[PDB]
Amino acid sequence: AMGTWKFFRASVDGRPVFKKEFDKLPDQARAALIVLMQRYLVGDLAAGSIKPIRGDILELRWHEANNHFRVLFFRWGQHPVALTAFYANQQKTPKTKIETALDRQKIWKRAFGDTPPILE
């Protein structure tokens, strides 16, 4: 169901940074976000669920909970790579989160390559 999703870590060996962030969220929100991540791959999201943020960064938003839970990610070839997961109060995704996302994309691309290897 989660297909080609990846989860930000700083190195092939490093701390599972995205998962530690994700895991702190409430059960109901974690379950809802997994469903959105699965649907993202199928192509059947409603318009409230996916927003372009800046550059290559995209946002999954849990619409049924006033977009209070979100995942920033980017497409690394055919693999969406989850960069940060967070609770948010305002509709405007905060600057700090977007900077973290941009920073983690650069970190990822530097450690693992700008695009996936042709064979995994």
For the chain, list the domains and their CATH numbers: 6-112 (3.30.2310.20)
Look-up of token digits 């839970």? 69
Cα 103 to Cα 106: distance, rounded to the nearest angstrom: 5
CA 114 and chain centroid, separation: 17
Technique used to solve these coordinates: X-ray
Residue 7, CB half-sphere, CA atoms under 13 Å: how many? 16
Residues 6+ away with beta carbon under 8 Å from 56: 74, 75, 105
Specified resolution (Å) = 1.9
- Strands 57-61 and 50-54, sheet pairing: antiparallel
Can you list the pairs that 40-49 forms with residues at least 24 positions away whose Cβ atoms lie under 8 Å?
A: 40/80, 41/2, 41/3, 41/4, 41/5, 41/80
Q: How many other CB atoms sit within 10 Å of the CB of residue 56? A: 15
